[PDB]
Design a protein around this motif. Structure first.
Motif, PDB file in Angstrom:
ATOM      1  N   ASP A  34       0.768  18.470 -93.909  1.00 52.52           N
ATOM      2  CA  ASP A  34       0.450  19.098 -95.177  1.00 52.52           C
ATOM      3  C   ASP A  34       1.698  19.123 -96.048  1.00 52.52           C
ATOM      4  O   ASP A  34       2.802  19.253 -95.531  1.00 52.52           O
ATOM      5  CB  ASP A  34      -0.094  20.524 -94.994  1.00 52.52           C
ATOM      6  CG  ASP A  34      -0.802  21.055 -96.227  1.00 52.52           C
ATOM      7  OD1 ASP A  34      -0.095  21.310 -97.234  1.00 52.52           O
ATOM      8  OD2 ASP A  34      -2.062  21.175 -96.188  1.00 52.52           O
ATOM      9  N   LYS A  36       2.687  21.546 -97.980  1.00 53.23           N
ATOM     10  CA  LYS A  36       3.256  22.845 -98.299  1.00 53.23           C
ATOM     11  C   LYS A  36       4.156  23.331 -97.177  1.00 53.23           C
ATOM     12  O   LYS A  36       4.074  22.819 -96.057  1.00 53.23           O
ATOM     13  CB  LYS A  36       2.096  23.792 -98.564  1.00 53.23           C
ATOM     14  CG  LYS A  36       1.193  23.307 -99.680  1.00 53.23           C
ATOM     15  CD  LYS A  36       1.858  23.287-101.048  1.00 53.23           C
ATOM     16  CE  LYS A  36       1.050  22.446-102.019  1.00 53.23           C
ATOM     17  NZ  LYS A  36       1.410  22.732-103.430  1.00 53.23           N
ATOM     18  N   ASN A  38       5.813  25.873 -94.325  1.00 57.49           N
ATOM     19  CA  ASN A  38       5.247  26.448 -93.129  1.00 57.49           C
ATOM     20  C   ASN A  38       5.012  27.945 -93.265  1.00 57.49           C
ATOM     21  O   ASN A  38       4.149  28.489 -92.597  1.00 57.49           O
ATOM     22  CB  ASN A  38       6.146  26.124 -91.952  1.00 57.49           C
ATOM     23  CG  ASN A  38       5.962  24.679 -91.528  1.00 57.49           C
ATOM     24  OD1 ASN A  38       5.070  23.994 -92.031  1.00 57.49           O
ATOM     25  ND2 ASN A  38       6.742  24.219 -90.562  1.00 57.49           N
ATOM     26  N   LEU A  41       1.657  27.977 -95.085  1.00 59.23           N
ATOM     27  CA  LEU A  41       0.540  27.558 -94.280  1.00 59.23           C
ATOM     28  C   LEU A  41       0.260  28.601 -93.207  1.00 59.23           C
ATOM     29  O   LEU A  41      -0.900  28.817 -92.859  1.00 59.23           O
ATOM     30  CB  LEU A  41       0.818  26.207 -93.631  1.00 59.23           C
ATOM     31  CG  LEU A  41       0.959  25.026 -94.576  1.00 59.23           C
ATOM     32  CD1 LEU A  41       1.278  23.788 -93.768  1.00 59.23           C
ATOM     33  CD2 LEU A  41      -0.275  24.792 -95.436  1.00 59.23           C
ATOM     34  N   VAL A  74       4.228  20.261 -87.341  1.00 63.61           N
ATOM     35  CA  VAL A  74       3.758  20.168 -88.702  1.00 63.61           C
ATOM     36  C   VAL A  74       4.607  19.149 -89.463  1.00 63.61           C
ATOM     37  O   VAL A  74       5.829  19.272 -89.461  1.00 63.61           O
ATOM     38  CB  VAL A  74       3.838  21.544 -89.359  1.00 63.61           C
ATOM     39  CG1 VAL A  74       3.526  21.432 -90.818  1.00 63.61           C
ATOM     40  CG2 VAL A  74       2.947  22.566 -88.667  1.00 63.61           C
ATOM     41  N   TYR A  75       3.956  18.158 -90.092  1.00 67.30           N
ATOM     42  CA  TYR A  75       4.636  17.157 -90.912  1.00 67.30           C
ATOM     43  C   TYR A  75       4.295  17.394 -92.375  1.00 67.30           C
ATOM     44  O   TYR A  75       3.506  18.281 -92.701  1.00 67.30           O
ATOM     45  CB  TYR A  75       4.304  15.734 -90.450  1.00 67.30           C
ATOM     46  CG  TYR A  75       4.785  15.492 -89.046  1.00 67.30           C
ATOM     47  CD1 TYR A  75       6.145  15.438 -88.767  1.00 67.30           C
ATOM     48  CD2 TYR A  75       3.904  15.450 -87.977  1.00 67.30           C
ATOM     49  CE1 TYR A  75       6.618  15.301 -87.470  1.00 67.30           C
ATOM     50  CE2 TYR A  75       4.361  15.298 -86.677  1.00 67.30           C
ATOM     51  CZ  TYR A  75       5.722  15.227 -86.417  1.00 67.30           C
ATOM     52  OH  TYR A  75       6.196  15.096 -85.123  1.00 67.30           O
ATOM     53  N   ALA A  76       4.948  16.629 -93.261  1.00 61.35           N
ATOM     54  CA  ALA A  76       4.709  16.762 -94.689  1.00 61.35           C
ATOM     55  C   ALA A  76       4.908  15.425 -95.391  1.00 61.35           C
ATOM     56  O   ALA A  76       5.708  15.333 -96.321  1.00 61.35           O
ATOM     57  CB  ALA A  76       5.607  17.823 -95.266  1.00 61.35           C
TER      58      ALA A  76
HETATM   59 CS    CS Z   1       4.852  21.319 -93.715  1.00 55.69          CS
END
Ligand code: CS
Ligand code: NAD
Ligand code: NAD
Ligand code: NAD
Ligand code: NAD
Ligand code: CS
Ligand code: CS
Ligand code: CS
Lengths: 334, 336, 336, 334
Positions: A34, A36, A38, A41, A74-76
C-alpha cells in the motif's frame, strides 16, 4: 496453509484480512502492499467505523505490521512490477486497489512472483469471472490464473437469479439496488464525473448506474441480454438490497417463488444464498457472511411479472464470497 | 375567502397551514383542533426541522394561536362530535389526524357544522378519492362531501401511470417506493405493530407495505388488479421516489417512454406532473410543489418491460396536491 | 447461581440480558416483566440495530421466552404489586422501566418476593446510589435494598472526577455531554414536554438538561455544589462523550493531568475507567465495557482551568457498570 | 455598484454568490475562476444539498455561466497570475479556493488587476483580519488591501467574547465547538493526515483541533493567550454551536450574563450577534444570517466559572459576515 498477499489495504483489503482471521484455517496473509504509511494503515486496521475494533494487538514499524504477534511485511510500490511476492512464498495475491481491474495490468503480480491473482471487482481481460456458488465448478486450475470475483451486487443477484431461472426461467428483468453509500461518493456537494454522485451522500437518495445486472451474464451466460438495472445510494454506511422485477412464461405464485429459494438454499450453496422469513432490516444483515439473503416476506407476483428482494452486506458478504473463491483456488493446483 | 378548518395540526396539518399562507389567494385557515397544548402547537408551527422558520410572528393563549396578526381559534376535542365548526363559519375541514380515515367517523365534522371534509390519507367508505390532475374532474359538488386525497405515493404513481397507460397500455406493473422515514417509525428499536417499523428508522433500510399500487385503481379504474408493490423506508427525513416496472404490448424505447411524459407534462397537468432531465437527488425535490417528478434519466427498457422512476416530496408535494383539491372544492357549491 | 428478574425489557433491559449472557458466570435471568407481547419482545431480543443478532435461538409462547434452550418466564403486569418474584426465586430485580425510579414505588418488588432492587437510572428516596468503582465499597448489604446505578453520564463523569479531585482538587466545574440520541426523543417534529426533544432527533443538535453533574455529589459528596452542566444530543445512535472544564488550586499541565489518570486506570478500577492515547471517534467506544474512557489527546490547560474529555457507550458501558454493581450485590447477604 | 470576482467556486464561493443575490443591492459578481468545467459548476450552483435550488435560471457555455439572464465570465487558471480582473473592472476578489490563504500568494490577484482581496479563511501574512461587528472600524482603506474574514468559528466566538469580556472580563477560557462535518473529512474510513478525520464523518463524533479560539486574539488583542479550544464534528450537514467555559473575577449570575448579551445585541451589532430565548435546535439556525446566535437557555454559572453557548450556520452565517465585510470595503476608498 497457502500464503496470501493483499495489494490495496483499503476497505475491501482490510475486510479480507479480517475475514481470513475470522473464517479461514488454511490461508495466511503474510504480506501487503500500500502507498500509505504503517501508522495510518495499522490505525485503520485496529479501528473500524463499521466492523468495530480488531480483537487483537496491532503493532507497526517501518517495514511491517504485527497482528496478534504475527508479523506482516508491508511494501509500498505503486507499481506491482517492483514487488517480490516470491520472497514471502506468496501463492495468491488479492488485487483490491481498484487501479488494476485490467488483468493485463494485474498480471504484473504473476511476473512479480505470484501464481494467482484474484481481482476484487469487475475486471477486463481476465481469464474468468466467478460468483462463488454459481459457476465456481467451472474454475480451471491450469488456465484461470488472473480472475475476478465480480461485484458485490452481482454476488447478490446471480445466486437468486440462477435458482429462479433454473426453476421458472427469466425472459427479461430489471433491477434496482438500494445500496449503502460508498467511498466513490462525496460527503459534501463537490465536482465528480457523475453529477449525481457529486451530491452529499449522507443526506441524499443518489441514483447511479451499475453494470452488475448485465455482468450476471458472465457467470450465467443463459441470461445474457436479459437483465439490466441501476442503483439508489441511500444514507446507510453498509448494507444493501437488490430488488429484481422479472417476467417469466411460467405461471407462478408468491408461494412457489419462495419455496424454490428455500428448496435451493441448503448445504454448501446455502452459505452463499440464504432464505429468510424474518422481519429483516438492513442492520440485521450487517456482518452477514452470505452473498445473498432472500427476503421471502417481500416477494410479489402480478400475472407473469415477479418482484423479489435479496439483501447483502456489500462489504462483508462480498468479502466472504471472495474468501470462498480464494479457498477454492488454494485447494487446487497452483 | 372560503374558511378552512384543520383537524390534526401535525406534519400534514402544519404543512397545509403553510401551503395556504404561501400558495392560496382565496382560502383562509381560521380554526384548528388538536389534542395537545398551544405552547407546543405554536412552537412547532414557528420552527420546523424540514421547512425551517415560519416567516411570521406567532403568539398563543388558552384558546387561540395568532399568526401574523390573524387569530386562529384552537380547540382540543379528541372526539369531533364536540366541535363547533359552524361557530367560525368553517366550510371545509381538513381531516389530518390519521384516526378518522373511516368516512363513517369523519362525517362527524359535517354534523358539527362543516359542509365538506377532505381526508389527508387513503380513506374507507368515502364518497370519492381523488388524485388532483388525474380524476378531479369527476368531482361531484352535490354528492362528494367526505372525500380522500389518497396517499403521497399514489399522488406520485397515478399521474405517471395514467399518461403511460393512456399512450402504451400497462398490462402488469410492480412498484417499489424508496421513501423517507415517517413519524410512525421508531427512533430506537421499540414495539410497533409492524415489526420492521419497530426498528431504528435513521440507521435502517426498513421494508414496509403500501396500498398505493392497488389504491391507484380507485382513481384509474382501468388499472384495477394490475399493480402491486411495497416500500423501502430509508434514512432521509423527506423526499421519496417511486420505481415502477411494468409490461406493455406496445413496442417502446427509452426515447418514446420519455417523450410521452414530456408531451403530457404541460399546462395545468404540468403542475401535478413534471418532466425532468436534470441530475436529481432527493434534496433537489424537497419543497417541490409537484405530485410527481418524472426522472427521464432513470428510464430503462428491456423487451416489453419498462422501468420508470418518479420523485416526490411526500410532505410538501402531497400537501400541494391536497391544496389543489381543496381549491377545486372551494370553487364549487358548498351547500348545507 | 443467583437468580435475576428484569422489570422493563427495553434498550437497557435487553442490554442487561445480553451482558449477563456474555459476561457473568454466576447470574441468570429467569423472569422478565414487560407490558408488550412476546412476539415483539422476542423479535427485539433476537435482532438489535445496535448490538446485532443475539447469537442464540429464541422461541416464545404465551407466557415465556426461551433463549438457547433456557425458558424465561414472562409476565405483563403494569403494576409490580401483581408480580410474583418469589414464584421463580428471583433474588434481584432490575427495575428498567423508567416509571419506578421513585424507590417508594420500586419497593413494590420487595413486597412481591424480591430481596433487592437495582434501579437502572437516577432514583428518588432510594437507600443508596452507586457508581461502581467510585463508591461501591460503601454498599451495605443489610440496609441497601433499593439502590440506584445512577445515569450513564454520571458513570462517565464520576470515575474521572474522583481521580482528579483526589489528586489536584476541583474547585468548580462545568460539563457538556455530547450524547447519542435516546428513545424518548422524537423521530419527526412532534409534541414532547421538552420542546427541544420534540425536534427530529436524527437531523438536529438538540440541547437538553441533565442532572449528572449535580448527581455526582451523591457518590462523591466532596463535590456537592461544585458541578453543573447540560447535554447536546447529536445524530449518532449510541456513544457519547463528557466534556468537563474545571478549576483547581494546583498548578497542572496536560502531562500531569494525563499521568494522574493513567496511574489510577489499573486493576479493578481500570475496568471502570480506561486511559487512552488512541485517535478515538465515537464508533470506537461502541460496545466498550468501561464506564469512562479518558481521552488523553483532548486534555487542555489554561492557567488553573482544565478541560478533560471522556467517552462512554451510554448503552453498553452503563449496562456493564450496572452488572458490576449487581455482581457485588449478588456476592453478599440477600436475606428476606 | 462595485464589481466582484470569486476565486474558487466551491461551497463558500457559491454561498457568497447566493448571498450577493439575496442580500446586497450594490455588489455584483461579474466573474469567477475555477478549475472545473462549466456544466459541473452550473449544476452545483443550480442544485444545493443544503440551500435548495437557486430560484433563477442557470445557463452555461464554455466561457460563462448566465444566472437570471446576467452573464458571469468564468476562467480556469490554477495560477491567479494569469487572470485579468481588470478586464471586467473587478475591484474586489473573494479568495475562497483554500490554496491562497498565504497573502503573499493571494496578492497575485492585485498584480492580476484587482484592488482588494478578501480571503475566506484564517490567513497568514495578511494586512488585517476582521470579524464584522467586532473590529471592522479598524479597517484602513489605504493600507488594508489583502485581508481575512477569519473562520466561521471565530465569527461565532469573537462577538460573544467581546460583549462578555467588555462587561465582566475573561481571565481564561476553553471552547468546544460541536460542529457540522465539513468537506475535509472522509465519508468512509480512509487515509488522512489527521487520523480522527480519517473516520466516516456521518456516523462518528470526531474530535479535531481548531485555531479558532486563539485567533480571537487577532480581532480582540486583549484576549491574547487567554482562550483555547477544540472541535467535535458531528453528523449534521451544517449548523454548529460554540460552547465557551470561562473564568471571570466578577461575581455573576445566569441572569446578568444573559442581560449583557441582550443589551448588546441591538442595532447594527445585532445583525452579527443575536440574543435568543427560543427552544432552538440546529435546524433552526440553518440559513441564519447572524455570525452568532446566543442561546440564553444554555447559560450556566458555578462560582466564578461561566458556560455560554452560541449557534452559527458555519456556511451561511459565515458568508453573511463576509458579505458585510465586503460591503464595508466597497463603501470606502478603493
Ligand atoms: Cs507501507
Ligand atoms: N461496497 C464496497 O466497499 C465494495 C463492494 C464490492 C466491491 N468493491 C471493490 O473493491 C475494490 C477496493 O475498494 P475499497 O472500497 O476497498 O477502496 P479503498 O479506497 O477503501 O481502498 C484502496 C486502497 O488502495 C491503496 N492503493 C491505491 N493505489 C495503490 C497502488 N497503486 N499500490 C498500492 N496500494 C494502492 C490505498 O492506499 C487504499 O488503502 C474496488 O474495485 C471496489 O469497487 C467494493
Ligand atoms: N409523508 C407524510 O407524512 C404523509 C403523507 C401523506 C399522508 N399523510 C397522512 O396525514 C395524516 C396525518 O399525518 P401526519 O404525518 O401529519 O401525522 P402527525 O402525527 O405528525 O400529526 C397528527 C396530529 O394529530 C393530533 N391528533 C391525534 N389524535 C387527535 C384527535 N383525536 N383529535 C385531534 N387531534 C388529534 C396530534 O396531536 C398531532 O398534532 C395521516 O393520515 C397520514 O397518513 C402523511
Ligand atoms: N442511554 C440509555 O438508553 C440509558 C442510559 C442510562 C439509563 N437509562 C435508563 O434505563 C431505563 C429504561 O430505559 P430504556 O432506554 O431501556 O427504555 P425503553 O423504553 O427502551 O424500555 C422500556 C421498556 O419498559 C416497558 N414498560 C413500560 N412501562 C412498563 C410497566 N409499567 N411495566 C412493565 N414494563 C413496562 C416497555 O414496554 C419497554 O419494553 C430508564 O430509566 C432510562 O433512563 C437509559
Ligand atoms: N463550514 C464551511 O464550509 C467553512 C466555514 C468557514 C470557512 N470556510 C473556508 O472557506 C474556504 C473554501 O472552503 P469550501 O468548503 O468552499 O471548499 P470547496 O472545496 O467546497 O471549494 C473549493 C473550490 O475551489 C476550486 N479550486 C481549487 N483550487 C483552485 C485553483 N487553484 N484555482 C481556481 N479554483 C480552484 C475547486 O474547483 C472548488 O470548486 C476554505 O478556506 C474553508 O476553510 C469554510
Ligand atoms: Cs353538498
Ligand atoms: Cs437485607
Ligand atoms: Cs471554468
Amino acid at each position: 496453509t497457502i500464503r496470501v498477499g493483499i495489494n490495496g489495504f483499503g476497505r475491501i483489503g482490510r475486510n479480507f484480512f479480517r475475514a481470513v482471521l475470522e473464517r479461514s484455517d488454511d490461508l495466511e496473509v503474510v504480506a501487503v502492499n500500500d502507498s500509505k504509511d504503517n501508522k495510518t494503515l495499522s490505525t485503520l486496521l485496529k479501528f473500524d467505523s463499521i466492523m468495530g475494533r480488531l480483537g487483537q494487538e496491532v503493532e507497526y514499524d517501518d517495514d511491517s505490521i504485527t497482528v496478534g504477534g504475527k508479523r506482516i511485511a508491508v511494501y509500498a510500490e505503486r507499481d506491482p512490477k517492483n514487488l517480490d511476492w516470491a520472497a514471502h512464498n506468496v501463492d495468491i495475491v488479492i488485487e483490491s486497489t481498484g487501479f488494476f481491474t485490467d488483468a493485463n495490468a494485474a498480471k504484473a503480480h504473476i511476473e512479480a512472483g505470484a501464481k494467482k491473482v484474484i481481482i476484487s471487482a469487475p475486471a477486463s481481460n481476465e481469464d474468468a469471472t466467478f460468483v462463488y456458488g454459481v459457476n465456481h465448478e467451472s474454475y480451471d486450475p491450469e488456465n484461470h490464473n488472473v480472475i475476478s470475483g465480480a461485484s458485490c451486487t452481482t454476488n447478490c443477484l446471480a445466486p437468486m437469479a440462477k435458482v429462479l431461472n433454473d426453476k421458472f426461467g427469466i425472459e427479461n428483468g430489471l433491477m434496482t439496488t438500494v445500496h449503502a453509500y460508498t467511498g466513490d461518493q462525496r460527503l459534501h456537494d463537490a465536482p465528480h464525473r457523475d453529477l449525481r454522485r457529486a451530491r452529499a451522500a449522507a443526506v441524499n437518495i443518489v441514483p447511479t448506474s451499475t453494470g452488475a445486472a448485465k455482468a450476471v451474464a458472465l457467470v450465467l451466460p443463459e441470461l445474457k441480454g436479459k437483465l439490466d438495472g441501476y442503483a439508489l445510494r441511500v444514507p446507510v454506511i453498509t448494507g444493501s438490497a437488490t430488488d429484481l422485477t422479472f417476467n417469466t412464461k411460467s405461471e407462478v405464485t408468491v408461494e412457489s417463488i419462495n419455496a424454490a429459494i428455500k428448496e435451493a438454499a441448503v448445504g454448501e450453496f446455502g452459505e452463499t444464498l440464504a432464505y429468510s422469513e424474518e422481519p429483516l432490516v438492513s442492520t440485521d444483515i450487517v456482518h452477514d457472511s452470505h452473498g445473498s439473503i432472500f427476503d421471502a416476506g417481500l416477494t410479489k407476483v402480478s400475472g407473469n411479472t415477479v418482484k423479489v428482494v435479496s439483501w447483502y452486506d456489500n462489504e462483508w458478504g462480498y468479502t466472504c464470497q471472495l474468501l470462498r473463491l480464494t479457498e477454492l483456488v488454494a485447494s487446487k493446483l497452483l
